[PDB]
């Protein structure tokens, strides 16, 4: 707890746990010794917390997700346990630099983006609020791949994150479980029997989730695939890899459905294990016995990925626990709650019934029965409307039959929510109209949030300290306290101190940029940042057009006053996403021309931030002046990066989409740079018909950019390299890039104006930060606790 | 003295007798972890396989090889 | 080729070539026997290479220079031929130590410093790349003098390097040629005739230049002066010495012009012989006939020293080959390329036309005509601007008329280049503005380089082997391959192995220091090294101030933690350079007080490295931790020693000058200790006015140093010994030593900090070595081949 | 080899610091592998390296059964 004792513990671990001394100890060794030293501080409360849940039996919440974008654990753990300052001092006294040791830790990147990071922020919040929550996922041997740029292109490298070992995970062999696949169904007189199946074992690994300063430590249980133990002998042993390939790697797709059998196996794998583990726990507690199940258990479905949980639970209740269908179904609906995270057609999960029949025979039967009972009702309430039956069916018939997992989640759940007002609204009245009309009270909204511990206290200590010195540390657990910040809007000194914090973050992050990339950084320039997964809907392309735009204006009139900028664009593209990869090449091509043109000089620098991940977001976010949140209105369910930048002192330029809409409401629309078409404008443009060749014909600045991109100005060695981009823009652009081009650029010009007025710029910054309270994930979970899970802190 | 060998994930198979015949079961001795071994990641090394031989003026060169890494694990004796 | 056969050949030479046996053989004898044994391995490829050039007639490159700082040949030759390991084994088996035999070889020091060493590295590179290159110089009987320190002062001894014979040179009597001097001009009806001249014969000596592992062996042809064969008889025979005095000794001046008639004779001597030898070869090959000359011949002028080549070629084409002026001039400009190596006023060659009229009458006429055609053009393009004529004239009128050789090189060449970006820029836009405005495409940059064979493989085998074991031997021919080294930045073991290599180099070099000098060396201290020719612009004085500074801090607080250092300063001073000699005395005076003060002990040792030369640089460079490259910004055209230290694992502390600027760009500025004024700061300080008495008044630490130096603290027996130094510092210091003093010292303090953090220090070392690829002379020659000579490997 | 170089080491002393027992023929390739390292990597002449090799290695035969060769 104190410095002297932390030094002894560190040396004790370096010695007994790493078998090293100071002369032969590696940096990794020091990091592991520090990690173990901090890890020991959690054990007492972790056992105590789990024991408490058993003795008092509070209702349990289970967040079931295929993704958990956790990032690094060491610093986070030191902050939530109140050890950082002590450890920093101890390490320094041992002659080491804690910051260097921290960089050794590999990110636990078992997610793709928002969906996976949301889940991670939720666990932190649930632990901070003292809830009996458990996160359940898959312990991927490989998480989201590590990204590199070779010759301007994204190159993928396996993210072998467990290679050197993971001190934050705890194998729980006594809770191992078998998961079945294939086989056939047998309807006997003693119940239905799913037999002749292939078995794969699931070994759970527990990771502690410490709440912020509250003595609570929950658990994140991730499952690992293992071959059972019961032709060529060698091949047979090697073939054990097949089963174990189930939890081998995370599918690297963000907002896109890939119907691969292996993925279907991962979905069921995590689902079968989790539900059996929850049932066992339930039956092992202080408890026909199952009638109290929904009062003791709440399972949240993170998107439709774990949709199979609905029939799996039914399978268990009926075939194993011998409950009648009617009862089983009732308990199921009371147990599950579904969160819809997207409206993009390509992201919708539709599994071919053929694939499901072969792999999960008993589950196909259960899904069919669920649909029968479901459609019999509709037929009753609407004897005529037969087209309504087709639109609400769990099965799609057009061509090869498929299963609409989202429909399956709606009927098997008692609550369904979008992740932002505009998204939830679209989900309730448009996408699932036929369902909400019958069950209105079933649909809700639960606007996303981000944890102020990792995304403020951890990533920007300077800002957390400044805020804390002015209004106390109360805000860490109740972010709505940041509103008190309005009391200092005319405080010139607090405004200079606010600016100093940002500048320090920029100077430090600049050192990172000149170290990782050649480029020379103008530390006074404006840090224009857009970091997120590469997507056509997110429009990194639109941003790219503006950069080329600024570049030409500079070449055109070199002597014309230009507010300097450092444009940073980063994010991974799904491996099979061709257009995303091309977009990356374009950006890298532009930067090369821009960063090396003598006429532009320190006026404009462009950086493609490589390997964007949680630990990297913690560095660049505190260093940002301008946050790009420019996806086409109605395409971004919510967004969370936007919230991160808001809490850390950046201004936002974006469209009225996702949570951007709610940010404007909290801070006031004038304090954000909103632009472009809105949900209604995009629809009108659709009914009419989007003809992109019109804006190109009516906007010279855009035409120059387009011609340069099309004629090879950015790829001399390959004149037609960006042909596919141009082709999509002129004939296949569902995200209407050309349509928001003019408004975007004019918006960008106003940002530049404001940037030249420090007093005005920071004043707005302060109103934003003051208005960010709403976006703490503690508030999100609070609403989940009260309106869906019915549990208390 | 130093012993040098391969860290097999599966040692010699566990033998069982089913209907009088020998049946082999994988010896997954590392499933629950081995506290007696100590990974030494700083000593990892590359091993080459396949490829071809190029006879240049700088001597013979073994090129176009597939690489595999070797991660040693020390056990106290 | 194999060991057994190398032993037989060695014994065969000891016997038949040295007429010795093991009982009477001297060390010199063994060395000669080994030398001949290795030398035999070159003959086959040397004849084969030269025969190949004749049969295929590739364009030939001729590097014309008064200097070739070759160093030793034995080891270099064994490495490039792949014989070292075999010879080492054979010699060892014969009961001998190859290292001891190698020390017998005299350095071929036919150069002063960089300019001469650059030429030597170029030949190695040109041979490694397989170019049909030839180096042409003078075979000085005496090279750069051997330096000794007697009573603290530099003392010069003749460097009689040929006394014992030279096995690496091959007399080519059949190619002897006559060179004329004096006489008068006769403009007859059969052409102009240069008659009644004094003749001196030039006998060429060829030295093989073997490329690295490629079977190519080029030639370095050095000319020797001999009296012709056609009052007192004895005196007459003795007077033959006059002619032969032409190639007697190398002028020992680095960056300084001495207008001595003998030097003018050496310049023309080497020029007349070379151009006649190239013409003969040209006419002897497969060829109005001369129209193809510029397509078969490229001559590079190493600085203005061989400027006379321009008119000499003209003389030949017009008076001998009977070509009309217009054509002759065209071919000349297509043949010559000029490399400017300096911007220091005192280094500029300006020969009095009177001297040139008497010695080279026909050449004065040709230079005058060249200037006429040259100024007639300017007058045409600028009828008004008559001051432009004066600034671009080949003749300077102010007082005694002189010839601006640099101007002569510019007009007679088709390419002119500086030796580093900042230098070339200054040469193109400032010094020769009037010329580059008319011919922009004529000026270029060709950043200097150093050969990785001698300066890595030969001087630091331990580092070459370490690197080779990690990334292969590919890097020897393509140094940009060292970037792969970045893959191991976090590899603790590779970092410990990198450090071990340096330490071994330090332990070995330490044995050399305790053997040559009394001083006891702290093998753990930091090796702070500044070795180069003594100059006011290079600022060995600034370094000296810092040493005295460190010394006082130690006396002041003996118990104050002090990072130990072994400061090494070495370099020869031009014999007539008074201030350089005084600077040497100061350093030696400081070391004497420092190395013998009980209170300082092993904290600080100072060594004036005597007789700095190529073979000595090969020993100290691999042993250096810190490289001093601190000349005043804008004074060092490029520098190459800086590159040597970078490739061998030392960190650099210097100003943004010469190639130092490009080193920072390649490795990243943070990975070097840059300090001081920059090109712009020095100019500002100039326009304003440099008042050195101000820094002395504002910096106590500097004042203490200055007072000690001025009051006799370092020369008790001679209180005013350093008066001239003090006087120059306070009133005549064009290099502003006092102006960079403060920044330098603060920079030095940071170096000490970093040195105490081995992990951090070596990590930076690795980034430097990884970023040194750019400085291989193979890359330099590659750019010369493509952009100036138009030749291929 | 890395351990040898990290200790107070060129390779002349290798056989005096290193003894490698080949348990049966299974690791037989260690012989040509050391030659490979010595010659292709360390650039030692063949004769010298072959000498260092034989001095370094020792072989233990564990069977004469034809089916085990
Ligand atoms: O494995 C030991 N310590 C552990 C310590 C550790 C634990 C968890 C994460 C990181 C480090 C170790 O070094 N690793 C586990 C990792 C893996 O799974 O590969 C690497 C260990 C200490 C020790 C001490 C003796 Cl005397 C003998 C054997 C020993 N092993
Ligand atoms: O893995 C931990 N201890 C280790 C202890 C261990 C080490 C070596 C052999 C057996 C046991 C552990 O339980 N295992 C390593 C094995 C594997 O890799 O499967 C199983 C551990 C302790 C701990 C304490 C906290 Cl607070 C959080 C996470 C934690 N993990
Ligand atoms: O000069 C002979 N060998 C040569 C061998 C040699 C050649 C080139 C450089 C160094 C050594 C010799 O000893 N020297 C040439 C040097 C000089 O120029 O002074 C010194 C030689 C061998 C020999 C053998 C007999 Cl039987 C008679 C006369 C002989 N001279
Ligand atoms: C927060 C975060 C995201 C989510 O970003 P959006 O802009 O909301 O898409 C994605 N990736 C990482 C690494 C994050 O930290
Ligand atoms: C490389 C070298 C030089 C050039 O040194 P600078 O520091 O570039 O002036 C001078 N002398 C010798 C002997 C060299 O080896
Ligand atoms: C399928 C998917 O990854 N959806 C993503 O979910 C997160 C968290 O709800 C949203 O912020 C984001 O806009 C959305 O694209
Ligand atoms: C006249 C002269 O010797 N110039 C020297 O040339 C070498 C080689 O170009 C440069 O590295 C150095 O800075 C410069 O002082
Ligand atoms: C987002 N996304 C992908 O991630 C993707 C894709 N095609 C393949 N992949 C992987 N498409 C068309 C797409 O929009
Ligand atoms: C690496 N890479 C790509 O990833 C790529 C490509 N063209 C299209 N893609 C997606 N090219 C030419 C390429 O080199
Ligand atoms: C470099 N240098 C010399 O080499 C020199 C000299 N005076 C005489 N010599 C030889 N001066 C003033 C000088 O700067
Ligand atoms: C050898 N030497 C010098 O070379 C010298 C000198 N004073 C000036 N110079 C240059 N003194 C006193 C001296 O002994």
């Amino acid at each position: 707890e104190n410095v002297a004792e932390l030094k002894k513990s560190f040396n004790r671990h370096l010695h007994f746990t790493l078998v090293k001394d100071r002369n032969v100890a590696t940096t990794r060794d020091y990091y592991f010794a520090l990690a173990h030293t901090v890890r020991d501080h959690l054990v007492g409360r972790w056992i105590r917390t789990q024991q408490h849940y058993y003795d008092k039996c509070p209702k349990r919440v289970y967040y079931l997700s295929l993704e958990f974008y956790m990032g690094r654990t060491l610093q986070n753990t030191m902050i939530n346990l109140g050890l950082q300052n002590a450890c920093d001092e101890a390490i320094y006294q041992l002659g080491l630099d804690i910051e260097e040791l921290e960089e050794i830790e590999e990110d636990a990147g078992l997610g793709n983006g928002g969906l996976g990071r949301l889940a991670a922020c939720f666990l932190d919040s649930m632990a901070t609020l003292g809830l009996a929550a458990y996160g359940y996922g898959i312990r991927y041997e490989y998480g989201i791949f590590n990204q590199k740029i070779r010759d301007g292109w994204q190159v993928e490298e396996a993210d072998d994150w467990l290679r050197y070992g993971n001190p934050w995970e705890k194998s729980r062999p006594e809770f191992m479980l078998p998961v079945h696949f294939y086989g056939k169904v047998e309807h006997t007189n003693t119940g239905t029997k799913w037999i002749d199946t292939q078995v794969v074992l699931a070994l759970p690994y527990d990771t502690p989730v410490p709440g912020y300063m509250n003595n609570t430590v929950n658990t994140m249980r991730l499952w690992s695939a293992r071959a059972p133990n019961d032709g060529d002998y060698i091949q047979a042993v090697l073939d054990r890899n097949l089963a174990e390939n189930i939890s081998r790697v995370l599918y690297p797709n963000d907002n896109f459905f890939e119907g691969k059998e292996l993925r279907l196996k991962q979905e069921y794998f995590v689902v079968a294990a989790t539900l059996q583990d929850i049932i066992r726990r339930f039956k092992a507690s202080k408890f026909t016995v199952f009638d109290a199940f929904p009062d003791q258990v709440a399972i949240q479905l993170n998107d439709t990925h774990p949709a199979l949980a609905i029939p799996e639970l039914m399978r268990i209740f009926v075939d194993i626990e011998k409950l009648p269908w009617s009862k089983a179904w009732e308990l199921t609906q009371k147990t599950f709650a579904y969160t819809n995270h997207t409206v993009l057609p390509e992201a919708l999960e539709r599994w071919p019934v053929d694939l499901v029949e072969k792999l999960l025979p008993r589950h196909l039967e259960i899904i069919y029965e669920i649909n029968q009972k479901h459609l019999d009702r509709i037929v009753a309430l609407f004897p005529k409307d037969v087209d309504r039956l087709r639109r609400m069916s769990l099965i799609e018939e057009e061509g090869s039959k498929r299963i609409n997992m989202a429909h399956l989640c709606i009927v098997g759940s008692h609550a369904v929510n979008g992740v932002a007002k505009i998204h939830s609204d679209i989900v309730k009245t448009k996408v699932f109209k036929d369902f909400s009309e019958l069950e209105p009270d079933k649909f809700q909204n639960k606007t996303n949030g981000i944890t102020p511990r990792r995304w403020l206290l951890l990533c920007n200590p300077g800002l957390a300290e400044l805020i804390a010195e002015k209004i106390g540390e109360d805000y860490v657990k109740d972010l709505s306290q940041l509103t008190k910040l309005h009391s200092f809007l005319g405080d010139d000194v607090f405004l200079r101190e606010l600016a100093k914090v940002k500048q320090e973050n920029k100077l430090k992050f600049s050192q990172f940029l000149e170290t990782e990339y050649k480029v020379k950084i103008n530390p006074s320039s404006m840090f224009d940042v857009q970091v997120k997964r590469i997507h056509e809907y997110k429009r990194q392309l639109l941003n790219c057009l503006h950069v080329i735009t600024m570049y030409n204006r500079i070449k055109k009139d070199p002597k014309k006053l230009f507010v300097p900028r450092t444009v940073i664009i980063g994010g991974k593209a799904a491996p099979g996403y061709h257009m995303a990869k091309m977009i990356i090449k374009l950006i890298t091509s532009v930067a090369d021309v821009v960063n090396n043109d003598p006429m532009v000089g320190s006026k404009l620098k462009v950086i493609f931030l490589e390997n964007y991940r949680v630990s990297l977001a913690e560095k660049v976010i505190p260093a940002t002046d301008l946050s790009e949140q420019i996806s086409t209105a109605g395409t971004e369910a919510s967004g969370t990066g936007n919230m991160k930048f808001m809490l850390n002192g950046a201004l936002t330029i974006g469209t009225m989409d996702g949570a951007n809409v709610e940010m404007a409401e909290e801070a006031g629309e004038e304090n954000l740079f909103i632009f472009g078409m809105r949900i209604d404008d995009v629809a009108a443009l659709d009914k009419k018909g989007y003809e992109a060749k019109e804006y190109y014909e009516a906007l010279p600045e855009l035409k120059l950019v387009i011609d340069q991109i099309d004629n090879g100005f950015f790829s001399p060695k390959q004149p037609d390299l960006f042909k596919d981009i141009i082709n999509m823009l002129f004939y296949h652009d569902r995200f209407k890039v050309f349509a928001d081009y003019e408004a975007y650029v004019k918006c960008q010009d106003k940002v530049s104006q404001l940037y030249m007025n420090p007093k005005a710029w920071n004043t707005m910054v302060l109103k934003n930060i003051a208005a960010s309270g709403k976006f703490s994930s503690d508030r999100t979970i609070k609403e989940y606790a009260q309106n869906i899970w019915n549990v208390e802190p």
Side-chain angles (χ1 to χ4, degrees), chain A:
Chain A
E1 300 280 356
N2 81 309
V3 178
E5 293 305 303
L6 285 170
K7 295 203 305 182
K8 286 174 188 171
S9 194
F10 175 95
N11 283 326
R12 204 189 305 116
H13 276 301
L14 184 64
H15 183 74
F16 294 105
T17 310
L18 284 307
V19 203
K20 286 280 176 60
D21 60 9
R22 295 308 294 283
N23 299 103
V24 182
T26 64
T27 302
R28 174 162 289 106
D29 289 323
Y30 294 135
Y31 162 72
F32 283 151
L34 170 49
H36 275 71
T37 299
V38 174
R39 182 185 89 173
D40 285 329
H41 286 82
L42 293 158
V43 179
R45 291 169 269 199
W46 198 14
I47 295 178
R48 195 163 294 128
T49 291
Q50 303 302 299
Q51 179 52 50
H52 178 63
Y53 295 152
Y54 174 74
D55 302 330
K56 302 283 75 62
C57 273
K59 192 180 177 177
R60 293 176 161 66
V61 178
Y62 293 107
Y63 204 76
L64 186 51
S65 168
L66 279 294
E67 304 187 15
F68 287 85
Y69 217 180
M70 302 292 283
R72 290 176 174 148
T73 293
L74 173 60
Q75 226 196 313
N76 187 234
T77 302
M78 293 194 284
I79 293 176
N80 284 41
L81 293 181
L83 296 178
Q84 174 148 263
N85 295 290
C87 290
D88 286 347
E89 178 62 8
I91 288 304
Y92 160 74
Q93 279 190 53
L94 290 176
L96 306 166
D97 172 12
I98 204 169
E99 184 267 59
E100 191 176 304
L101 305 190
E102 287 166 350
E103 294 304 314
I104 283 296
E105 171 166 36
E106 300 287 344
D107 280 45
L110 323 187
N112 275 290
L115 187 164
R117 178 59 234 180
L118 178 74
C121 286
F122 279 7
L123 297 183
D124 185 83
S125 282
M126 293 187 276
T128 293
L129 293 177
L131 296 183
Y134 299 84
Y136 275 81
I138 290 176
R139 175 173 172 284
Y140 299 112
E141 195 169 327
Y142 302 87
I144 191 59
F145 66 85
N146 270 303
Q147 181 200 64
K148 280 184 166 55
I149 307 296
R150 302 282 122 163
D151 187 66
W153 310 87
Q154 158 173 296
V155 164
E156 303 98 29
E157 291 193 0
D159 165 42
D160 185 18
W161 76 294
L162 295 164
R163 172 169 291 179
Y164 305 124
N166 180 22
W168 312 109
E169 59 171 34
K170 176 67 185 79
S171 186
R172 308 308 308 293
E174 67 268 32
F175 292 134
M176 195 156 66
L177 292 179
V179 170
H180 297 265
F181 295 93
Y182 299 103
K184 55 188 181 181
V185 187
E186 206 168 54
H187 307 285
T188 68
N189 57 47
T190 55
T192 293
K193 301 185 298 192
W194 181 17
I195 59 177
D196 300 309
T197 60
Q198 250 186 297
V199 181
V200 165
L201 303 180
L203 174 54
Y205 278 78
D206 286 356
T207 296
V209 182
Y212 180 75
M213 309 297 268
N214 65 6
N215 309 312
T216 288
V217 184
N218 287 335
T219 300
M220 174 184 63
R221 181 163 294 189
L222 296 185
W223 303 95
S224 195
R226 300 307 167 79
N229 310 304
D230 55 37
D232 180 58
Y233 163 77
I234 305 299
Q235 189 55 47
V237 174
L238 295 184
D239 285 345
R240 283 169 62 89
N241 301 328
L242 306 179
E244 280 158 33
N245 271 358
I246 297 178
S247 63
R248 190 77 71 189
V249 64
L250 163 80
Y251 268 79
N253 299 310
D254 182 282
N255 270 281
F256 188 78
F257 175 62
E258 248 182 358
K260 290 297 183 176
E261 192 182 355
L262 181 56
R263 171 70 177 183
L264 182 54
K265 283 179 179 172
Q266 301 186 316
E267 313 201 314
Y268 181 57
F269 174 74
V270 70
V271 142
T274 291
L275 288 177
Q276 290 184 45
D277 197 52
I278 290 165
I279 284 175
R280 147 180 281 180
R281 184 182 293 104
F282 176 82
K283 302 176 65 185
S285 61
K286 181 44 59 179
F287 300 175
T288 315
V289 178
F290 290 90
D291 277 42
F293 191 73
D295 298 287
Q296 276 292 76
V297 172
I299 301 173
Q300 197 66 52
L301 303 181
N302 206 28
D303 209 315
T304 63
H305 300 155
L308 287 171
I310 292 167
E312 181 50 24
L313 179 53
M314 285 290 74
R315 190 182 70 77
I316 302 184
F317 279 164
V318 174
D319 307 331
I320 304 290
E321 290 306 357
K322 303 300 184 181
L323 297 183
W325 186 275
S326 65
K327 182 72 173 188
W329 185 240
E330 169 193 59
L331 306 188
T332 291
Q333 302 179 68
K334 289 182 188 299
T335 305
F336 293 113
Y338 163 54
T339 292
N340 175 291
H341 292 269
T342 191
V343 291
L344 297 173
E346 55 271 52
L348 301 184
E349 293 201 288
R350 305 189 303 172
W351 297 103
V353 299
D354 277 7
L355 197 64
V356 176
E357 180 180 10
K358 181 227 302 187
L359 184 71
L360 309 168
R362 180 47 171 162
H363 293 77
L364 185 57
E365 307 191 326
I366 294 174
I367 291 170
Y368 275 145
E369 190 58 1
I370 284 169
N371 201 41
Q372 184 62 55
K373 299 303 205 308
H374 166 62
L375 294 183
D376 283 322
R377 171 79 66 63
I378 306 306
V379 166
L381 308 172
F382 309 83
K384 277 59 180 300
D385 204 354
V386 295
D387 180 27
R388 177 174 286 237
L389 288 184
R390 185 190 64 66
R391 301 197 307 284
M392 305 180 74
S393 175
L394 271 50
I395 305 303
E396 273 180 48
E397 322 293 7
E398 302 104 0
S400 69
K401 299 180 56 183
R402 300 162 106 69
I403 302 175
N404 193 305
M405 307 310 286
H407 284 183
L408 166 61
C409 288
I410 299 170
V411 309
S413 281
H414 74 77
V416 176
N417 72 281
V419 287
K421 295 185 187 183
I422 177 176
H423 167 245
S424 300
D425 178 73
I426 284 176
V427 173
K428 172 184 186 182
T429 65
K430 312 158 189 179
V431 184
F432 299 123
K433 173 179 170 63
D434 295 322
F435 292 84
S436 64
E437 300 182 321
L438 286 63
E439 294 176 291
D441 300 292
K442 169 173 285 188
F443 292 70
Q444 302 173 46
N445 179 68
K446 289 293 169 295
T447 296
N448 280 165
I450 58 163
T451 175
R453 269 71 67 172
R454 175 180 299 280
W455 301 110
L456 175 48
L457 266 66
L458 182 164
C459 68
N460 195 341
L463 178 58
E465 176 174 297
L466 181 62
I467 298 173
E469 181 187 295
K470 290 290 183 295
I471 65 179
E473 328 168 314
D474 309 83
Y475 77 98
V476 183
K477 296 183 176 185
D478 184 2
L479 200 64
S480 61
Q481 300 275 74
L482 294 175
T483 55
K484 298 179 178 181
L485 291 176
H486 281 93
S487 295
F488 314 84
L489 265 175
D491 180 349
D492 295 65
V493 175
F494 176 75
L495 291 182
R496 293 201 278 259
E497 279 167 356
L498 180 58
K500 185 174 174 60
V501 168
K502 173 62 60 180
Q503 189 55 53
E504 266 207 50
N505 296 334
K506 289 179 59 180
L507 217 45
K508 185 177 183 57
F509 189 67
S510 282
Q511 287 174 60
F512 170 89
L513 290 182
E514 300 206 357
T515 291
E516 308 302 69
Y517 314 81
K518 165 64 178 59
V519 188
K520 199 302 164 187
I521 305 305
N522 180 339
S524 77
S525 65
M526 177 212 288
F527 280 19
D528 188 328
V529 182
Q530 181 182 42
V531 289
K532 52 183 75 271
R533 286 296 289 271
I534 313 306
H535 274 281
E536 293 177 69
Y537 90 74
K538 291 181 176 292
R539 303 158 123 184
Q540 281 87 8
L541 256 177
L542 177 51
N543 192 333
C544 193
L545 294 185
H546 173 253
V547 164
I548 298 182
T549 299
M550 293 190 285
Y551 171 73
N552 294 318
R553 294 185 180 179
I554 286 181
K555 297 292 296 177
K556 184 174 176 297
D557 195 315
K559 302 175 185 301
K560 187 173 188 175
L561 302 305
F562 186 88
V563 186
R565 292 188 189 217
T566 299
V567 175
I568 302 167
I569 311 179
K572 291 168 193 180
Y577 193 6
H578 181 64
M579 192 55 71
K581 289 187 162 186
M582 291 304 306
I583 289 177
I584 282 181
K585 181 58 174 163
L586 176 64
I587 300 173
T588 54
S589 301
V590 172
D592 274 15
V593 167
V594 179
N595 305 337
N596 300 299
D597 185 347
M599 202 172 285
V600 57
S602 63
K603 283 194 178 72
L604 185 64
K605 295 301 180 178
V606 179
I607 300 302
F608 182 85
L609 197 56
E610 291 179 49
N611 210 43
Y612 185 58
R613 58 184 187 295
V614 175
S615 74
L616 222 196
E618 293 161 4
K619 292 175 178 69
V620 59
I621 291 177
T624 300
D625 282 316
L626 182 70
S627 165
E628 305 269 357
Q629 305 298 341
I630 57 182
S631 65
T632 314
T635 70
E636 194 70 81
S638 169
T640 53
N642 55 356
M643 297 165 188
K644 297 170 190 178
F645 287 98
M646 178 182 206
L647 174 63
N648 277 276
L651 290 186
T652 300
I653 180 164
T655 55
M656 287 299 266
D657 191 16
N660 286 6
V661 172
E662 296 181 59
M663 280 169 64
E665 301 188 327
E666 296 303 295
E669 202 175 318
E670 67 262 57
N671 297 310
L672 271 92
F673 300 89
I674 306 298
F675 71 92
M677 303 176 265
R678 304 198 175 189
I679 190 61
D680 288 20
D681 298 293
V682 169
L685 187 53
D686 270 308
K687 179 160 58 181
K688 160 190 169 58
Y690 177 58
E691 300 312 315
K693 60 188 303 180
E694 294 190 0
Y695 306 77
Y696 166 75
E697 241 67 293
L699 303 172
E701 284 202 301
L702 169 54
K703 183 163 186 294
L704 179 53
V705 165
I706 295 306
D707 295 321
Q708 297 178 303
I709 298 177
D710 184 61
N711 299 319
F713 186 84
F714 290 110
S715 48
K717 298 300 180 62
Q718 298 162 296
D720 62 303
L721 183 55
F722 305 117
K723 176 189 295 303
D724 291 351
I725 293 185
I726 301 297
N727 198 78
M728 168 280 272
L729 285 171
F730 282 83
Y731 314 109
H732 302 59
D733 190 1
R734 296 182 301 152
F735 309 117
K736 309 165 177 55
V737 178
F738 288 8
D740 279 321
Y741 175 77
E742 176 168 46
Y744 179 53
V745 181
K746 296 179 181 299
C747 198
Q748 285 282 29
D749 293 316
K750 297 193 69 296
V751 176
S752 292
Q753 276 200 302
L754 196 65
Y755 198 65
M756 300 188 284
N757 186 346
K759 178 72 198 310
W761 181 281
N762 286 297
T763 287
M764 196 175 292
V765 167
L766 183 52
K767 290 184 178 181
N768 275 255
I769 299 176
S772 56
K774 180 178 193 297
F775 304 108
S776 157
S777 49
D778 291 340
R779 183 278 308 161
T780 298
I781 299 297
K782 190 148 175 299
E783 288 171 347
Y784 266 98
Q786 298 200 195
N787 305 307
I788 303 176
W789 311 326
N790 187 56
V791 291
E792 300 180 5

